[PDB]
Every structure is written in C-alpha cells, then in structure tokens.
UniProtKB/Swiss-Prot annotation, chain B:
Primary role: ATP-dependent serine protease that mediates the selective degradation of misfolded, unassembled or oxidatively damaged polypeptides as well as certain short-lived regulatory proteins in the mitochondrial matrix. Endogenous substrates include mitochondrial steroidogenic acute regulatory (StAR) protein, DELE1, helicase Twinkle (TWNK) and the large ribosomal subunit protein MRPL32/bL32m. MRPL32/bL32m is protected from degradation by LONP1 when it is bound to a nucleic acid (RNA), but TWNK is not. May also have a chaperone function in the assembly of inner membrane protein complexes.
Tissue: Duodenum, heart, lung and liver, but not thymus.
Disease: CODAS syndrome: A rare syndrome characterized by the combination of cerebral, ocular, dental, auricular, and skeletal features. These include developmental delay, craniofacial anomalies, cataracts, ptosis, median nasal groove, delayed tooth eruption, hearing loss, short stature, delayed epiphyseal ossification, metaphyseal hip dysplasia, and vertebral coronal clefts.
Organism: Homo sapiens (Human)
UniProt superkingdom: Eukaryota
Protein name (database record): Lon protease homolog, mitochondrial
Domain writeup: The Lon N-terminal domains are crucial for the overall structure of the protein, maintaining it in a conformation allowing its proper functioning.
Part of the whole protein covered: 123 to 152 of 959
Family: Belongs to the peptidase S16 family.
Localization in the cell: Mitochondrion matrix
C-alpha cells in the first residue's frame, strides 16, 4: 500500500494487529490477497488448498 | 483514588510516548 497504492490506507489503521480485533485471521489473509492483481484462476487455486 | 483506565489493547512501554484511543465515552466524563 506504500509502494503501489490502490485503496485507502485507513482500513489498516482501523483494523490493527494491536487492537486484538482480528477474530478471523482468515479474513485478514483473504483481504490482503484480494488486493493482489493475480489472475482469478490462481485465486480459485488458492482457495482449493486445504492446509 | 480514581478508577482504572480502560487501556483496551494499548501498550505504553516505559519511556516511550504513546497514544490511547478508547472507544467508551464514560472516560470522557472522568
């Protein structure tokens, strides 16, 4: 978000790791992977993984 | 003799200026 700004950076300051409000780490990883420009197929493949 | 403040996930390291943003408004009265 500093070297390739796409969306606002306020959401990361609202949702911080020091607030203990990350009840769902999976959502944080999905939100971080959604910012990627990786092709959709690859995203589906990432969802296919079980571990 | 005042009630404890609601730190609410905010560490204040010794000799380190820090900022606190509690969500409650009952602390604004105190």
């Amino acid at each position: 978000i500093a070297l390739n700004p796409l969306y606002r950076e306020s959401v990361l300051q609202m949702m911080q790791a020091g607030q203990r409000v990350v009840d769902n780490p999976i959502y944080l990883s999905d939100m971080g992977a959604a910012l990627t420009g990786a092709e959709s197929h690859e995203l589906q493949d990432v969802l296919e993984e079980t571990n | 003799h005042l009630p404890l403040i609601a730190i609410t996930r905010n560490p204040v390291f010794p000799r380190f200026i820090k900022i606190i943003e509690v969500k409650n408004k009952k602390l604004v009265e105190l």
